[PDB]
Design a protein around this ligand. Structure first.
Ligand SMILES: *CCS(=O)(=O)c1ccc(Nc2nc(OCC3CCCCC3)c3nc[nH]c3n2)cc1
Lengths: 299, 258
Protein backbone atom coordinates (compact mmCIF):
# COMPACT_ATOMS: atom_id res chain seq x y z
CA UNK A 1 0.00 0.00 0.00
CA UNK A 2 2.58 2.36 1.41
CA UNK A 3 5.35 0.16 -0.07
CA UNK A 4 6.07 2.87 -2.69
CA UNK A 5 6.42 5.81 -0.28
CA UNK A 6 9.61 6.75 1.55
CA UNK A 7 9.03 9.08 4.59
CA UNK A 8 11.44 12.02 4.68
CA UNK A 9 10.39 14.03 7.79
CA UNK A 10 7.42 15.27 9.80
CA UNK A 11 5.88 18.58 8.73
CA UNK A 12 3.27 19.21 11.41
CA UNK A 13 -0.13 18.52 12.90
CA UNK A 14 -3.17 20.43 11.61
CA UNK A 15 -6.81 20.14 12.70
CA UNK A 16 -6.45 16.28 12.84
CA UNK A 17 -3.84 13.62 12.02
CA UNK A 18 -0.14 14.23 11.29
CA UNK A 19 1.46 15.37 8.03
CA UNK A 20 4.80 14.01 6.73
CA UNK A 21 6.86 14.74 3.70
CA UNK A 22 7.42 11.57 1.65
CA UNK A 23 8.50 10.49 -1.82
CA UNK A 24 7.15 8.08 -4.33
CA UNK A 25 10.00 5.70 -5.06
CA UNK A 26 8.78 4.70 -8.50
CA UNK A 27 7.84 8.09 -9.96
CA UNK A 28 10.03 10.44 -7.85
CA UNK A 29 7.04 12.55 -6.79
CA UNK A 30 7.41 14.34 -3.47
CA UNK A 31 4.11 14.23 -1.53
CA UNK A 32 2.60 15.23 1.78
CA UNK A 33 1.12 12.21 3.61
CA UNK A 34 -1.56 12.80 6.21
CA UNK A 35 -1.74 9.93 8.62
CA UNK A 36 -5.06 9.39 10.45
CA UNK A 37 -5.40 6.88 13.28
CA UNK A 38 -8.51 4.81 13.30
CA UNK A 39 -7.79 2.44 16.34
CA UNK A 40 -7.75 5.63 18.50
CA UNK A 41 -11.45 5.84 17.54
CA UNK A 42 -13.54 3.14 18.42
CA UNK A 43 -15.77 6.00 17.31
CA UNK A 44 -14.48 4.87 13.78
CA UNK A 45 -13.58 7.19 10.88
CA UNK A 46 -13.57 10.76 12.20
CA UNK A 47 -16.11 13.30 10.84
CA UNK A 48 -13.25 15.66 9.92
CA UNK A 49 -11.73 13.02 7.60
CA UNK A 50 -15.09 12.11 6.08
CA UNK A 51 -15.67 15.82 5.23
CA UNK A 52 -12.14 16.65 4.15
CA UNK A 53 -11.97 13.66 1.75
CA UNK A 54 -15.48 13.81 0.22
CA UNK A 55 -15.09 17.59 -0.38
CA UNK A 56 -11.51 17.57 -1.52
CA UNK A 57 -12.25 14.92 -4.14
CA UNK A 58 -14.73 17.38 -5.71
CA UNK A 59 -12.52 20.44 -5.45
CA UNK A 60 -9.96 20.34 -8.21
CA UNK A 61 -8.39 23.77 -8.71
CA UNK A 62 -4.85 25.22 -9.03
CA UNK A 63 -5.24 27.17 -5.72
CA UNK A 64 -6.64 24.34 -3.69
CA UNK A 65 -4.31 21.69 -2.39
CA UNK A 66 -4.72 18.52 -4.48
CA UNK A 67 -5.72 15.20 -2.89
CA UNK A 68 -3.95 12.57 -4.96
CA UNK A 69 -4.95 9.31 -3.25
CA UNK A 70 -6.53 7.74 -0.18
CA UNK A 71 -4.88 4.61 1.20
CA UNK A 72 -6.78 2.37 3.65
CA UNK A 73 -5.80 -0.05 6.37
CA UNK A 74 -8.01 -1.44 9.04
CA UNK A 75 -6.00 0.89 11.42
CA UNK A 76 -4.74 3.84 9.41
CA UNK A 77 -5.92 6.04 6.63
CA UNK A 78 -3.29 7.90 4.63
CA UNK A 79 -4.21 10.85 2.46
CA UNK A 80 -1.70 11.57 -0.27
CA UNK A 81 -1.45 15.25 -1.22
CA UNK A 82 0.66 17.28 -3.55
CA UNK A 83 3.58 18.68 -1.50
CA UNK A 84 4.05 22.41 -1.10
CA UNK A 85 7.28 24.03 0.16
CA UNK A 86 6.18 26.26 3.07
CA UNK A 87 3.30 28.07 4.73
CA UNK A 88 2.56 31.76 4.45
CA UNK A 89 3.28 32.34 8.16
CA UNK A 90 6.87 31.08 7.81
CA UNK A 91 7.25 33.11 4.61
CA UNK A 92 6.06 36.27 6.34
CA UNK A 93 8.60 35.80 9.18
CA UNK A 94 11.38 35.13 6.64
CA UNK A 95 10.31 38.46 5.06
CA UNK A 96 10.36 40.44 8.43
CA UNK A 97 13.37 42.63 7.75
CA UNK A 98 12.95 43.02 3.94
CA UNK A 99 9.01 43.06 3.56
CA UNK A 100 6.76 41.12 1.06
CA UNK A 101 6.79 42.97 -2.33
CA UNK A 102 3.36 44.38 -3.39
CA UNK A 103 3.29 42.42 -6.71
CA UNK A 104 3.60 39.21 -4.70
CA UNK A 105 0.94 40.24 -2.14
CA UNK A 106 -1.37 41.10 -4.99
CA UNK A 107 -0.63 37.79 -6.80
CA UNK A 108 -1.24 35.78 -3.58
CA UNK A 109 -4.47 37.56 -2.74
CA UNK A 110 -5.74 37.11 -6.34
CA UNK A 111 -4.94 33.40 -6.25
CA UNK A 112 -6.55 32.89 -2.83
CA UNK A 113 -9.70 34.61 -4.00
CA UNK A 114 -9.78 32.24 -7.04
CA UNK A 115 -9.49 29.26 -4.72
CA UNK A 116 -12.14 30.57 -2.41
CA UNK A 117 -14.55 31.47 -5.24
CA UNK A 118 -14.17 27.89 -6.45
CA UNK A 119 -15.00 26.55 -2.93
CA UNK A 120 -18.00 28.82 -2.56
CA UNK A 121 -19.33 27.92 -6.09
CA UNK A 122 -19.17 24.27 -5.02
CA UNK A 123 -21.10 24.79 -1.81
CA UNK A 124 -18.04 24.48 0.48
CA UNK A 125 -17.10 26.72 3.41
CA UNK A 126 -13.47 26.47 4.49
CA UNK A 127 -13.94 27.96 8.01
CA UNK A 128 -10.27 28.06 9.02
CA UNK A 129 -8.36 30.37 6.71
CA UNK A 130 -5.16 31.58 8.41
CA UNK A 131 -1.55 31.87 7.26
CA UNK A 132 -0.59 28.42 8.62
CA UNK A 133 -3.20 26.86 6.28
CA UNK A 134 -2.02 28.68 3.14
CA UNK A 135 0.80 26.94 1.40
CA UNK A 136 3.17 28.33 -1.22
CA UNK A 137 5.57 26.84 -3.74
CA UNK A 138 8.82 27.89 -5.43
CA UNK A 139 6.87 28.79 -8.60
CA UNK A 140 4.70 31.63 -7.18
CA UNK A 141 1.58 29.58 -6.39
CA UNK A 142 -0.37 29.76 -3.13
CA UNK A 143 -3.07 27.24 -2.18
CA UNK A 144 -5.79 26.66 0.38
CA UNK A 145 -4.97 23.71 2.67
CA UNK A 146 -6.30 21.93 5.78
CA UNK A 147 -9.96 21.36 4.97
CA UNK A 148 -10.54 19.50 8.26
CA UNK A 149 -12.87 22.27 9.50
CA UNK A 150 -14.65 22.59 6.15
CA UNK A 151 -18.24 21.80 5.38
CA UNK A 152 -20.86 21.41 2.66
CA UNK A 153 -23.58 24.12 2.87
CA UNK A 154 -27.14 24.37 1.60
CA UNK A 155 -28.97 27.31 0.01
CA UNK A 156 -30.23 28.99 2.08
CA UNK A 157 -27.91 27.96 4.94
CA UNK A 158 -28.91 26.65 8.27
CA UNK A 159 -27.26 26.97 11.70
CA UNK A 160 -23.85 25.34 11.58
CA UNK A 161 -21.16 24.66 14.25
CA UNK A 162 -20.45 27.83 16.30
CA UNK A 163 -16.93 26.93 17.49
CA UNK A 164 -15.42 27.87 14.19
CA UNK A 165 -12.44 29.76 12.65
CA UNK A 166 -9.26 30.59 14.59
CA UNK A 167 -9.98 33.53 16.93
CA UNK A 168 -7.80 36.24 15.21
CA UNK A 169 -9.49 35.53 11.80
CA UNK A 170 -13.08 35.07 13.09
CA UNK A 171 -15.88 37.18 11.66
CA UNK A 172 -18.07 39.45 13.82
CA UNK A 173 -21.29 37.56 13.00
CA UNK A 174 -19.81 34.39 14.59
CA UNK A 175 -18.49 36.36 17.67
CA UNK A 176 -21.94 37.93 18.10
CA UNK A 177 -23.59 34.48 18.05
CA UNK A 178 -25.62 34.84 14.83
CA UNK A 179 -27.96 31.99 14.00
CA UNK A 180 -26.78 31.86 10.39
CA UNK A 181 -23.41 32.41 8.81
CA UNK A 182 -22.12 31.71 5.33
CA UNK A 183 -19.43 32.38 2.71
CA UNK A 184 -18.80 35.91 4.05
CA UNK A 185 -16.93 34.34 7.05
CA UNK A 186 -14.17 33.08 4.71
CA UNK A 187 -13.89 36.54 3.05
CA UNK A 188 -13.50 38.13 6.52
CA UNK A 189 -10.59 35.78 7.21
CA UNK A 190 -9.00 36.63 3.91
CA UNK A 191 -9.37 40.37 4.53
CA UNK A 192 -7.45 39.92 7.85
CA UNK A 193 -4.76 38.03 5.90
CA UNK A 194 -4.47 40.69 3.21
CA UNK A 195 -3.84 43.34 5.97
CA UNK A 196 -1.36 40.93 7.55
CA UNK A 197 0.73 40.44 4.39
CA UNK A 198 1.10 44.22 4.10
CA UNK A 199 2.00 45.09 7.78
CA UNK A 200 3.41 41.68 8.83
CA UNK A 201 1.32 41.59 11.95
CA UNK A 202 -2.10 40.23 12.64
CA UNK A 203 -4.77 42.81 12.24
CA UNK A 204 -6.87 41.72 15.27
CA UNK A 205 -4.76 39.52 17.62
CA UNK A 206 -7.38 39.18 20.42
CA UNK A 207 -6.95 37.09 23.61
CA UNK A 208 -10.66 36.24 24.13
CA UNK A 209 -13.97 36.60 22.29
CA UNK A 210 -14.70 39.98 23.94
CA UNK A 211 -11.13 41.24 23.39
CA UNK A 212 -11.39 40.20 19.69
CA UNK A 213 -14.72 42.17 19.30
CA UNK A 214 -13.26 45.22 21.00
CA UNK A 215 -10.17 45.16 18.77
CA UNK A 216 -12.38 44.96 15.65
CA UNK A 217 -14.68 47.79 16.98
CA UNK A 218 -11.63 50.10 17.61
CA UNK A 219 -10.49 49.76 14.02
CA UNK A 220 -13.80 49.72 12.14
CA UNK A 221 -16.10 51.54 14.58
CA UNK A 222 -18.67 49.98 16.87
CA UNK A 223 -21.47 48.83 14.52
CA UNK A 224 -24.96 50.26 14.88
CA UNK A 225 -28.32 49.74 13.11
CA UNK A 226 -27.28 52.17 10.34
CA UNK A 227 -24.05 50.34 9.42
CA UNK A 228 -25.38 46.80 10.11
CA UNK A 229 -29.18 46.35 10.35
CA UNK A 230 -30.06 43.89 13.10
CA UNK A 231 -26.71 44.03 15.07
CA UNK A 232 -28.42 45.28 18.22
CA UNK A 233 -30.75 42.21 18.37
CA UNK A 234 -27.96 39.69 17.84
CA UNK A 235 -27.65 37.21 20.69
CA UNK A 236 -24.27 38.26 22.10
CA UNK A 237 -24.56 41.97 21.38
CA UNK A 238 -24.55 44.07 24.61
CA UNK A 239 -25.89 47.63 24.71
CA UNK A 240 -23.05 48.33 27.18
CA UNK A 241 -20.46 47.78 24.37
CA UNK A 242 -18.25 50.84 24.11
CA UNK A 243 -19.06 53.00 21.11
CA UNK A 244 -15.78 53.65 19.24
CA UNK A 245 -15.52 55.88 16.19
CA UNK A 246 -14.36 54.29 12.94
CA UNK A 247 -10.74 54.63 11.83
CA UNK A 248 -10.01 55.93 8.39
CA UNK A 249 -8.40 53.07 6.43
CA UNK A 250 -5.30 54.91 5.39
CA UNK A 251 -4.35 54.56 9.09
CA UNK A 252 -5.36 50.87 9.26
CA UNK A 253 -2.89 49.73 6.59
CA UNK A 254 -0.72 52.76 5.83
CA UNK A 255 1.38 51.32 2.98
CA UNK A 256 -1.78 50.44 0.94
CA UNK A 257 -2.78 52.49 -2.14
CA UNK A 258 -6.36 53.70 -2.81
CA UNK A 259 -7.44 50.54 -4.67
CA UNK A 260 -6.04 48.28 -1.96
CA UNK A 261 -7.86 50.20 0.74
CA UNK A 262 -11.12 50.03 -1.19
CA UNK A 263 -10.76 46.25 -1.54
CA UNK A 264 -9.82 45.67 2.08
CA UNK A 265 -12.77 47.75 3.27
CA UNK A 266 -15.26 45.72 1.19
CA UNK A 267 -13.78 42.49 2.59
CA UNK A 268 -14.14 43.82 6.24
CA UNK A 269 -17.66 45.16 5.85
CA UNK A 270 -19.67 44.37 8.99
CA UNK A 271 -22.88 43.34 7.27
CA UNK A 272 -22.19 39.86 5.73
CA UNK A 273 -24.73 40.69 2.99
CA UNK A 274 -22.71 43.74 1.94
CA UNK A 275 -19.29 42.05 2.36
CA UNK A 276 -17.74 41.49 -1.06
CA UNK A 277 -17.83 37.99 -2.60
CA UNK A 278 -14.64 36.29 -3.72
CA UNK A 279 -16.06 36.21 -7.26
CA UNK A 280 -16.80 39.98 -7.30
CA UNK A 281 -13.43 40.74 -5.66
CA UNK A 282 -11.50 39.18 -8.59
CA UNK A 283 -12.74 42.12 -10.75
CA UNK A 284 -11.66 44.84 -8.33
CA UNK A 285 -9.30 47.46 -9.87
CA UNK A 286 -6.57 46.52 -7.36
CA UNK A 287 -5.91 43.52 -9.59
CA UNK A 288 -5.75 45.29 -12.98
CA UNK A 289 -1.93 44.94 -13.13
CA UNK A 290 -1.67 41.57 -11.36
CA UNK A 291 1.21 39.28 -12.36
CA UNK A 292 2.62 36.13 -10.89
CA UNK A 293 6.04 36.70 -9.40
CA UNK A 294 8.16 33.94 -8.00
CA UNK A 295 9.10 34.42 -4.33
CA UNK A 296 12.66 34.24 -2.81
CA UNK A 297 12.41 30.77 -1.05
CA UNK A 298 14.72 29.76 1.67
CA UNK A 299 13.82 26.15 2.14
CA UNK B 1 -25.84 33.82 -0.59
CA UNK B 2 -27.63 34.92 -3.90
CA UNK B 3 -24.39 35.42 -5.68
CA UNK B 4 -23.40 31.68 -5.74
CA UNK B 5 -27.00 30.50 -5.99
CA UNK B 6 -26.92 29.65 -9.66
CA UNK B 7 -23.36 28.17 -9.67
CA UNK B 8 -24.44 25.89 -6.81
CA UNK B 9 -27.70 24.81 -8.52
CA UNK B 10 -25.82 24.00 -11.73
CA UNK B 11 -23.23 22.02 -9.85
CA UNK B 12 -25.81 19.99 -7.89
CA UNK B 13 -27.60 19.17 -11.23
CA UNK B 14 -24.32 17.73 -12.48
CA UNK B 15 -23.53 15.80 -9.28
CA UNK B 16 -27.04 14.32 -8.92
CA UNK B 17 -26.45 12.37 -12.11
CA UNK B 18 -23.14 10.98 -10.77
CA UNK B 19 -24.60 9.96 -7.37
CA UNK B 20 -27.60 8.30 -9.00
CA UNK B 21 -28.27 4.70 -7.94
CA UNK B 22 -28.94 1.97 -10.46
CA UNK B 23 -32.68 1.98 -11.23
CA UNK B 24 -33.03 -1.79 -11.56
CA UNK B 25 -30.95 -2.95 -8.60
CA UNK B 26 -33.52 -4.78 -6.47
CA UNK B 27 -34.18 -7.26 -9.32
CA UNK B 28 -30.51 -8.26 -8.95
CA UNK B 29 -30.66 -8.65 -5.17
CA UNK B 30 -31.45 -12.32 -4.60
CA UNK B 31 -32.42 -12.01 -0.95
CA UNK B 32 -33.99 -8.50 -0.42
CA UNK B 33 -36.97 -6.69 -1.88
CA UNK B 34 -38.47 -3.23 -2.19
CA UNK B 35 -40.72 -4.08 0.73
CA UNK B 36 -37.71 -4.90 2.98
CA UNK B 37 -36.09 -1.61 1.88
CA UNK B 38 -39.31 0.29 2.76
CA UNK B 39 -39.20 -1.27 6.22
CA UNK B 40 -35.57 -0.13 6.64
CA UNK B 41 -36.11 3.45 5.47
CA UNK B 42 -39.17 3.75 7.72
CA UNK B 43 -37.03 2.60 10.64
CA UNK B 44 -34.42 5.26 9.75
CA UNK B 45 -37.18 7.89 9.87
CA UNK B 46 -37.91 6.81 13.50
CA UNK B 47 -34.21 6.80 14.32
CA UNK B 48 -33.99 10.35 12.91
CA UNK B 49 -36.89 11.44 15.20
CA UNK B 50 -35.50 9.66 18.25
CA UNK B 51 -32.10 11.47 17.98
CA UNK B 52 -33.51 14.72 16.58
CA UNK B 53 -31.52 14.45 13.39
CA UNK B 54 -31.85 16.72 10.39
CA UNK B 55 -33.99 15.66 7.45
CA UNK B 56 -30.88 16.12 5.25
CA UNK B 57 -29.15 13.37 7.25
CA UNK B 58 -31.99 10.97 6.50
CA UNK B 59 -31.94 11.84 2.75
CA UNK B 60 -28.11 11.31 2.61
CA UNK B 61 -28.34 7.96 4.40
CA UNK B 62 -30.91 6.68 1.91
CA UNK B 63 -28.70 7.81 -1.02
CA UNK B 64 -25.73 5.92 0.55
CA UNK B 65 -27.87 2.80 0.96
CA UNK B 66 -29.22 2.81 -2.60
CA UNK B 67 -25.73 3.33 -4.08
CA UNK B 68 -24.21 0.59 -1.87
CA UNK B 69 -26.93 -1.92 -2.81
CA UNK B 70 -26.47 -0.95 -6.47
CA UNK B 71 -23.18 -2.91 -6.44
CA UNK B 72 -23.19 -5.09 -3.26
CA UNK B 73 -25.38 -8.10 -2.83
CA UNK B 74 -26.70 -8.23 0.78
CA UNK B 75 -28.56 -10.89 2.73
CA UNK B 76 -31.73 -9.81 4.60
CA UNK B 77 -30.10 -10.40 7.97
CA UNK B 78 -27.51 -7.75 7.08
CA UNK B 79 -29.67 -5.06 5.50
CA UNK B 80 -30.10 -3.20 8.81
CA UNK B 81 -26.33 -3.21 9.36
CA UNK B 82 -25.86 -1.43 6.02
CA UNK B 83 -28.58 1.06 7.00
CA UNK B 84 -27.12 1.68 10.46
CA UNK B 85 -23.64 2.39 9.05
CA UNK B 86 -25.15 4.66 6.38
CA UNK B 87 -27.01 6.70 9.03
CA UNK B 88 -23.78 6.91 11.10
CA UNK B 89 -21.84 8.23 8.10
CA UNK B 90 -24.62 10.64 7.18
CA UNK B 91 -24.69 11.91 10.75
CA UNK B 92 -20.96 12.38 10.78
CA UNK B 93 -21.09 14.28 7.46
CA UNK B 94 -24.07 16.47 8.20
CA UNK B 95 -24.69 16.86 11.98
CA UNK B 96 -23.24 19.34 14.40
CA UNK B 97 -23.46 16.68 17.20
CA UNK B 98 -23.86 13.27 15.62
CA UNK B 99 -24.92 10.41 17.88
CA UNK B 100 -21.96 8.39 19.08
CA UNK B 101 -21.36 4.90 17.76
CA UNK B 102 -22.73 3.25 20.90
CA UNK B 103 -26.09 4.94 20.30
CA UNK B 104 -26.20 3.41 16.83
CA UNK B 105 -25.44 -0.04 18.31
CA UNK B 106 -28.15 0.45 20.92
CA UNK B 107 -30.97 1.24 18.35
CA UNK B 108 -30.30 -2.00 16.41
CA UNK B 109 -31.28 -3.91 19.68
CA UNK B 110 -27.80 -5.56 19.75
CA UNK B 111 -28.65 -7.47 16.56
CA UNK B 112 -25.07 -6.35 15.66
CA UNK B 113 -21.96 -5.62 17.65
CA UNK B 114 -20.04 -2.40 17.62
CA UNK B 115 -17.09 -3.70 15.69
CA UNK B 116 -19.56 -4.93 13.02
CA UNK B 117 -21.01 -1.41 12.77
CA UNK B 118 -17.52 0.08 12.47
CA UNK B 119 -16.42 -2.45 9.87
CA UNK B 120 -19.55 -1.84 7.79
CA UNK B 121 -18.87 1.87 8.11
CA UNK B 122 -15.53 1.32 6.45
CA UNK B 123 -16.87 -1.01 3.72
CA UNK B 124 -19.56 1.51 2.86
CA UNK B 125 -16.86 4.22 2.53
CA UNK B 126 -14.77 1.94 0.28
CA UNK B 127 -17.75 1.08 -1.88
CA UNK B 128 -18.82 4.70 -2.32
CA UNK B 129 -15.13 5.73 -2.74
CA UNK B 130 -15.71 8.44 -0.10
CA UNK B 131 -18.13 10.32 -2.39
CA UNK B 132 -20.57 11.34 0.35
CA UNK B 133 -21.45 14.97 -0.57
CA UNK B 134 -24.51 13.84 -2.54
CA UNK B 135 -27.33 16.12 -3.66
CA UNK B 136 -30.69 15.31 -2.12
CA UNK B 137 -34.36 16.11 -2.72
CA UNK B 138 -34.09 18.26 0.37
CA UNK B 139 -31.28 20.42 -1.07
CA UNK B 140 -33.28 21.16 -4.21
CA UNK B 141 -36.52 21.89 -2.30
CA UNK B 142 -34.77 24.45 -0.12
CA UNK B 143 -33.61 26.38 -3.20
CA UNK B 144 -37.06 26.10 -4.82
CA UNK B 145 -38.68 27.52 -1.65
CA UNK B 146 -36.95 30.86 -2.35
CA UNK B 147 -39.25 31.33 -5.34
CA UNK B 148 -42.40 31.60 -3.20
CA UNK B 149 -44.45 34.79 -3.15
CA UNK B 150 -44.56 35.11 -0.18
CA UNK B 151 -43.15 32.10 1.77
CA UNK B 152 -45.84 29.77 3.04
CA UNK B 153 -44.59 27.47 5.75
CA UNK B 154 -47.36 24.89 5.21
CA UNK B 155 -46.32 24.65 1.54
CA UNK B 156 -42.72 24.15 2.71
CA UNK B 157 -43.50 21.44 5.28
CA UNK B 158 -45.92 19.65 2.92
CA UNK B 159 -43.24 19.57 0.16
CA UNK B 160 -40.70 18.07 2.59
CA UNK B 161 -43.37 15.56 3.67
CA UNK B 162 -43.99 14.40 0.05
CA UNK B 163 -40.27 14.28 -0.82
CA UNK B 164 -39.75 12.18 2.27
CA UNK B 165 -42.52 9.71 1.27
CA UNK B 166 -40.65 9.17 -1.99
CA UNK B 167 -37.68 7.72 -0.03
CA UNK B 168 -39.78 4.71 1.15
CA UNK B 169 -40.72 3.21 -2.27
CA UNK B 170 -37.81 2.24 -4.61
CA UNK B 171 -40.47 1.46 -7.22
CA UNK B 172 -41.21 3.96 -8.70
CA UNK B 173 -38.96 6.76 -7.22
CA UNK B 174 -35.50 5.34 -7.95
CA UNK B 175 -35.97 6.28 -11.61
CA UNK B 176 -36.41 9.97 -10.89
CA UNK B 177 -33.62 12.37 -10.10
CA UNK B 178 -33.74 14.38 -6.84
CA UNK B 179 -34.31 17.69 -8.67
CA UNK B 180 -37.37 16.17 -10.42
CA UNK B 181 -38.85 14.70 -7.22
CA UNK B 182 -38.30 18.07 -5.57
CA UNK B 183 -40.11 19.69 -8.50
CA UNK B 184 -43.10 17.39 -8.28
CA UNK B 185 -43.22 17.73 -4.48
CA UNK B 186 -43.05 21.55 -4.57
CA UNK B 187 -45.76 21.82 -7.23
CA UNK B 188 -48.05 19.31 -5.51
CA UNK B 189 -47.65 21.05 -2.08
CA UNK B 190 -48.21 24.48 -3.57
CA UNK B 191 -51.35 23.37 -5.44
CA UNK B 192 -52.74 21.43 -2.42
CA UNK B 193 -52.34 24.41 -0.08
CA UNK B 194 -52.75 27.57 -2.27
CA UNK B 195 -54.17 26.30 -5.60
CA UNK B 196 -51.12 27.74 -7.43
CA UNK B 197 -48.69 26.03 -9.78
CA UNK B 198 -45.04 25.40 -10.54
CA UNK B 199 -43.93 29.02 -11.04
CA UNK B 200 -42.49 30.62 -14.17
CA UNK B 201 -39.29 31.62 -12.33
CA UNK B 202 -38.53 27.91 -11.62
CA UNK B 203 -39.05 27.01 -15.28
CA UNK B 204 -36.31 29.58 -15.97
CA UNK B 205 -34.06 28.24 -13.20
CA UNK B 206 -34.52 24.44 -13.72
CA UNK B 207 -35.76 24.09 -17.28
CA UNK B 208 -38.54 21.83 -15.94
CA UNK B 209 -42.12 22.49 -17.04
CA UNK B 210 -45.25 20.93 -15.67
CA UNK B 211 -45.17 18.74 -18.82
CA UNK B 212 -41.72 17.40 -17.94
CA UNK B 213 -42.63 16.85 -14.24
CA UNK B 214 -45.87 15.03 -15.16
CA UNK B 215 -44.74 11.39 -14.89
CA UNK B 216 -43.24 11.95 -11.37
CA UNK B 217 -46.28 14.04 -10.37
CA UNK B 218 -48.65 11.25 -11.39
CA UNK B 219 -46.69 8.81 -9.21
CA UNK B 220 -46.39 11.26 -6.30
CA UNK B 221 -50.09 12.18 -6.33
CA UNK B 222 -50.97 8.48 -6.01
CA UNK B 223 -48.48 8.00 -3.14
CA UNK B 224 -50.07 10.99 -1.35
CA UNK B 225 -53.63 9.71 -1.85
CA UNK B 226 -52.67 6.26 -0.58
CA UNK B 227 -50.37 7.37 2.29
CA UNK B 228 -52.96 6.50 4.97
CA UNK B 229 -53.04 2.76 3.79
CA UNK B 230 -49.34 2.28 3.25
CA UNK B 231 -47.75 -0.39 5.43
CA UNK B 232 -45.10 2.20 6.49
CA UNK B 233 -46.43 5.09 8.60
CA UNK B 234 -43.52 6.74 10.45
CA UNK B 235 -43.33 9.71 8.03
CA UNK B 236 -47.08 10.45 8.50
CA UNK B 237 -46.59 10.36 12.32
CA UNK B 238 -43.54 12.66 12.21
CA UNK B 239 -45.36 15.24 10.08
CA UNK B 240 -48.31 15.52 12.54
CA UNK B 241 -45.93 17.50 14.71
CA UNK B 242 -46.33 21.26 15.07
CA UNK B 243 -42.69 21.66 14.08
CA UNK B 244 -43.93 20.59 10.56
CA UNK B 245 -47.29 22.41 10.90
CA UNK B 246 -49.21 19.15 11.14
CA UNK B 247 -49.21 18.93 7.30
CA UNK B 248 -49.71 15.17 7.19
CA UNK B 249 -53.27 16.05 8.34
CA UNK B 250 -54.05 18.07 5.14
CA UNK B 251 -56.31 16.48 2.55
CA UNK B 252 -54.68 15.56 -0.69
CA UNK B 253 -56.55 16.88 -3.79
CA UNK B 254 -58.88 14.39 -5.51
CA UNK B 255 -57.44 15.39 -8.93
CA UNK B 256 -54.82 17.67 -10.52
CA UNK B 257 -55.28 20.23 -13.33
CA UNK B 258 -53.73 19.15 -16.67
C1 LIG C 1 6.33 24.82 9.53
C2 LIG C 1 6.67 23.92 8.38
S1 LIG C 1 6.92 24.70 6.79
O1 LIG C 1 6.28 25.99 6.81
O2 LIG C 1 8.33 24.64 6.47
C3 LIG C 1 6.04 23.66 5.66
C4 LIG C 1 4.66 23.71 5.63
C5 LIG C 1 3.96 22.93 4.73
C6 LIG C 1 4.65 22.07 3.86
N1 LIG C 1 3.91 21.24 2.94
C7 LIG C 1 2.65 20.78 3.05
N2 LIG C 1 2.06 20.75 4.26
C8 LIG C 1 0.81 20.32 4.35
O3 LIG C 1 0.16 20.24 5.57
C9 LIG C 1 0.93 20.56 6.75
C10 LIG C 1 0.02 21.08 7.82
C11 LIG C 1 -0.94 22.14 7.28
C12 LIG C 1 -1.82 22.72 8.37
C13 LIG C 1 -0.98 23.28 9.51
C14 LIG C 1 -0.05 22.23 10.08
C15 LIG C 1 0.84 21.63 8.99
C16 LIG C 1 0.14 19.88 3.22
N3 LIG C 1 -1.08 19.38 3.00
C17 LIG C 1 -1.13 19.13 1.70
N4 LIG C 1 0.01 19.49 1.08
C18 LIG C 1 0.84 19.95 2.02
N5 LIG C 1 2.08 20.41 1.89
C19 LIG C 1 6.04 22.03 3.91
C20 LIG C 1 6.74 22.82 4.80
Amino acid sequence: SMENFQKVEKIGEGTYGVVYKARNKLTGEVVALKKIRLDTETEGVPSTAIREISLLKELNHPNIVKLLDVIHTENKLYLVFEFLHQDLKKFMDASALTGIPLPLIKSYLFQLLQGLAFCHSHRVLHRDLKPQNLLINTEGAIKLADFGLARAFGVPVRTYTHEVVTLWYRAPEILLGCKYYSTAVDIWSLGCIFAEMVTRRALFPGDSEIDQLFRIFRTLGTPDEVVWPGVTSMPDYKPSFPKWARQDFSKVVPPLDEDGRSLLSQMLHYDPNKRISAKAALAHPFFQDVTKPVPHLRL
Amino acid sequence: VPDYHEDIHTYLREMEVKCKPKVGYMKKQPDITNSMRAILVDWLVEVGEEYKLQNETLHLAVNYIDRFLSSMSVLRGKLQLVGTAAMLLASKFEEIYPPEVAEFVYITDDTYTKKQVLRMEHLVLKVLTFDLAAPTVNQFLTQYFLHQQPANCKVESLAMFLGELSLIDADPYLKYLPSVIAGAAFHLALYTVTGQSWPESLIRKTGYTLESLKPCLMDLHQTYLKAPQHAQQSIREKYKNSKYHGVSLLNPPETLNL
